[PDB]
Curated annotation (Swiss-Prot), chain A:
It comes from Cereibacter sphaeroides. Changing residue 250 to A: Abolishes ATPase and activase activities. ATPase involved in the activation of red-type RuBisCo (ribulose-1,5-bisphosphate carboxylase/oxygenase), which tends to form inactive complexes with its substrate ribulose 1,5-bisphosphate (RuBP). Catalyzes the release of RuBP from inhibited RuBisCo in an ATP-dependent manner. Activation of RuBisCO involves the ATP-dependent carboxylation of the epsilon-amino group of lysine leading to a carbamate structure. Belongs to the CbxX/CfxQ family. One of its GO terms (molecular function) is ATP binding. ATP binds at residues 63-70. This is Protein CbbX. InterPro entries: AAA+_ATPase (IPR003593), AAA_lid_6 (IPR041627), ATPase_AAA_core (IPR003959), CbxX/CfqX_mono (IPR000470), CbxX/CfxQ (IPR000641), CbxX/CfxQ_RuBisCO_ESX (IPR050773), P-loop_NTPase (IPR027417). Changing residue 127 to Q: Abolishes ATPase and activase activities.
């Protein structure tokens, strides 16, 4: 007659999954609160079905690389299975090259078989928009879309689909293939790490390698981070790693060229302001 | 030296209208587009010209092919693409274009990264488009002089004047942006036969839609939520990138999220579960400005 939401929250073990996500995803509170929130709606809409009032679950995760897309998607498959929306809470992750066949006619079995594997859980199409390439001739992508779109409509109660990738490309993909928008019930946005967070990471990375930055070099990175995030294909922590790898190289070539004579652990463990500002990022790319 | 015409001497327009399946396509458009008279009526008039021109060809009067490309302008969620599907069909039943398919395309489908990569991308898309119609969503993004889309426009333009009995092109997007595009790129005006302007739905119409949307999912509004939504619609409609029915769904969606979270925070029956309170709508950034 009336329902207890907290009981179902504690009953499903959905709380456990949300803890498992805060423990397994390095502080991206913004996204985590959005997953907390959707978990609430998923909970309520479950209780609504229970008191006698056919869902819709497909979703889209958009943002840059290294923003938690997959590791959230995994926890989502779990959560979904916990709240009885899915039979076996398991995540089949797949690119476009897992769905489109090279030879004519050999796409529809391949897409169908991936879907056979996916049944009872979640399919995760990474950079889905690459299914639609009328740019390429002899690309049979249009057909994998047809089948995808078909399952999301009809054969629903055994599958949840997650499209993922860059937001700009996802939006364009919807333009050309509409009828996806009315099949995605959750448009989740994954933003980057804040500057202070990106700096903390860069800090820890150098701690684990045994390197220190000079105070002046620290502010160089901060200048760097802020610039980089605004340039194309920003990969968050991979972009940091990549900047440090390059800084380490430049430092090694400072010390080898400077060749003043013998040098101690400080000089060798130190990344200087020179090593970061030499980056093309400060020039424009 | 003799000249003898072997064309028929008269033609019945309605008999042709009905017999070619052109009448049915317009009726499908009426089924498939939620009441948008002005555009449906504007389309009908374009369909009359197509009919009469085809009539003129049958009587053996057509000199060249008519110019029959067009430009659909307006906000998202106003029928543009679904009207395009129909134009394709109608142009097909009137045998203006070979096969009735429509190829839908964005800036990214035509403009690549590294140098010299653009022309073959566009040319392939155009190849797949021949025989039918090409829909270019936000076609103005091809031209960003601030990056090799300039070449795509030039191929696009050359094709529109030259081979008319293969491809029909429908450009689409926001009116003001599409206007400046034509400014910055003359020659497109010469080619476009029809400017079809798509208007928004009314506050009343959108409220109807939101109403049915709730009913399907068995949600009810409190009197104060009714008040708030009406207010919301009125504000949201003068804010950037208004998407009619779509942005109504998103607004109810975001209300459904806010409502769910409200309960879970602060035992409940089917009424308390299916109800949306004022707060769940009023929380939207649409009231604070954004």
């Amino acid at each position: 007659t009336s329902i207890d939401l907290r009981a179902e929250y504690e009953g499903s073990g959905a709380k456990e999954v949300l803890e498992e996500l805060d423990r397994e995803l390095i502080g991206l509170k913004p996204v985590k609160d959005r997953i907390r929130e959707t978990a609430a709606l998923l909970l309520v809409e479950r209780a609504r079905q229970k008191l006698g009032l056919t869902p819709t679950l497909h979703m889209s995760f958009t943002g840059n690389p290294g923003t938690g897309k997959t590791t959230v998607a995994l926890k989502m498959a779990g959560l979904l299975h916990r709240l009885g929306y899915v039979r076996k809470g398991h995540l089949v992750s797949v690119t476009r090259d897992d769905l489109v066949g090279q030879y004519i006619g050999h796409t529809a079995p391949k897409t169908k078989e991936v879907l056979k594997r996916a049944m009872g859980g979640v399919l995760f199409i990474d950079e889905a928009y690459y299914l639609y390439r009328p740019d390429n001739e002899r690309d049979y992508g249009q057909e994998a879309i047809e089948i995808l779109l078909q399952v999301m409509e009809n054969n629903r109660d055994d599958l949840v689909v997650i499209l993922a990738g860059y937001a700009d490309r996802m939006e364009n993909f919807f333009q050309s293939n509409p009828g996806f928008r009315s099949r995605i019930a959750h448009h989740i946005e994954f933003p980057d790490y804040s500057d202070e967070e990106l700096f903390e990471i860069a800090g820890h990375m150098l701690d684990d390698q045994n390197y220190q930055m000079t105070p002046e070099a620290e502010t160089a990175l901060r200048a760097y981070i802020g610039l980089r995030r605004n340039q194309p294909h920003f990969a968050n922590a991979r972009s940091i790693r990549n900047a440090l790898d390059r800084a380490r190289l430049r430092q090694a070539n400072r010390l080898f060229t400077a060749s003043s004579g013998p040098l101690d652990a400080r000089a060798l463990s130190t990344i200087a302001e020179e090593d970061i500002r030499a980056s093309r990022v400060f020039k424009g790319g």
